[PDB]
Design a protein around this ligand. Structure first.
Ligand SMILES: O=C(O)c1ccc(-c2cc3cccnc3c(-c3cccc([N+](=O)[O-])c3)n2)cc1
Ligand SMILES: [Mg+2]
Ligand SMILES: [Zn+2]
Length: 334
């Protein structure tokens, strides 16, 4: 097969090249990347991030195998879902790619731990049906039964992400050793399960505790001596990336917000149709986009990021400021 310059076919290679100069920046505009990448934002951004970090050479990942898996992974995100489609995956991946390069964590993680984190981010919402875990539980769906109503979607994302490695020429980990494959899998399972919003409060509580006894070197670089601390940082890193929409430039944040509300509202219309209790913020007849974001930032997003900023101080001060600015805008927009 053919491997394009930026991993995917494009009729606007120059505009795409232009946007990709921001690959390692929080400011990257994934929406434009998607437009130029013909909708293959995940395959493109992932291809570029792996080249950027020299991961193909580092783990002896055949390039055609990488692109085949990525195309397959992206193909398994639902285009008919407003928010949880491949664009969200590409964004969380790209965001994680940036957070991994934070000064406070320089030289902290191995290439394998880095590989695991990016893979986790890329597959964290694959095959998402566009409805919450509770909806699946309330409808007695096959998935909820399969996973005992516990982290239903998250368990499914993991099962799919790993299963797709078995389609023709899709095993990107074929050349890793057995111990590396098992370590990677353990870390990935840990990170994706941590994206289940019902674990948010506990996660944040444990993160604050960790920040309390935070260890640093002379340069100000975090000191993570044991696996426990490294994976805890990685769990929270992916979680933050998953909830980074409010920390991005207002122009992008607003687009992300319209997508999530559209997905929520459709779940609500369906719950109404089936005579089900309408989930929080899913009733378009009463829910407010602006009101919801202010609350979301006030009680979920700002507390999380404020703690993250604390952990890698002062690396995320700018991100925090933007979040507060966006909070101000939505509040005044009410
Ligand atoms: O169960 C899940 O897997 C899940 C649930 C909610 C969100 C989510 C994403 C947002 C992205 C951008 C702005 N808002 C998002 C919100 C959200 C929007 C308004 C209010 C709240 N909230 O928690 O109050 C949350 N929720 C993602 C995943
Ligand atoms: Mg999810
Ligand atoms: Zn997500």
């Amino acid at each position: 097969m053919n491997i394009p310059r930026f991993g995917v076919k494009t009729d606007q290679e120059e505009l795409l090249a232009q946007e990709l100069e921001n690959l390692n920046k929080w400011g990257l505009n994934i929406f434009c990347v998607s437009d130029y990448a013909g909708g293959r934002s995940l395959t493109c951004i992932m291809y570029m991030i792996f080249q950027e970090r020299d991961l193909l050479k580092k783990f002896r990942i055949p390039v055609d195998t990488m692109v085949t898996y990525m195309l397959t992974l992206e193909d398994h995100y639902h285009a008919d879902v407003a928010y949880h489609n491949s664009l969200h995956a590409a964004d969380v991946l790209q965001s994680t790619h940036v957070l991994l390069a934070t000064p406070a964590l320089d030289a902290v993680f191995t290439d394998l731990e880095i590989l695991a984190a990016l893979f986790a981010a890329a597959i964290h919402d694959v095959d998402h049906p566009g409805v919450s875990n509770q909806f699946l539980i309330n409808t007695n769906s096959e998935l909820a039964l399969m996973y005992n109503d516990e982290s239903v979607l998250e368990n499914h994302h993991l099962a799919v992400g790993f299963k797709l490695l078995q389609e023709d020429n899709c095993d990107i980990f074929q050349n890793l050793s057995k111990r590396q494959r098992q370590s990677l899998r353990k870390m990935v399972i840990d990170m994706v399960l941590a994206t289940d919003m019902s674990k948010h409060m506990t996660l944040l509580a444990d993160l604050k505790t960790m920040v309390e006894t935070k260890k640093v070197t002379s340069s100000g670089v975090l000191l993570l001596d044991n696996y426990s601390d490294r994976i805890q940082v990685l769990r929270n890193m992916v979680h933050c990336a998953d909830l980074s929409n409010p920390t991005k430039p207002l122009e992008l944040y607003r687009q992300w917000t319209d997508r999530i509300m559209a997905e929520f509202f459709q779940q609500g219309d369906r719950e109404r149709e089936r005579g089900m209790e309408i989930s929080p913020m899913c009733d378009k007849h009463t829910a407010s986009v602006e009101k919801s974001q202010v609350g979301f930032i006030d009680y979920i997003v700002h507390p999380l990021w404020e703690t993250w900023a604390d952990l890698v101080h002062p690396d995320a001060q700018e991100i925090l400021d933007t979040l507060e600015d966006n909070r101000d805008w939505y509040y005044s927009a009410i």
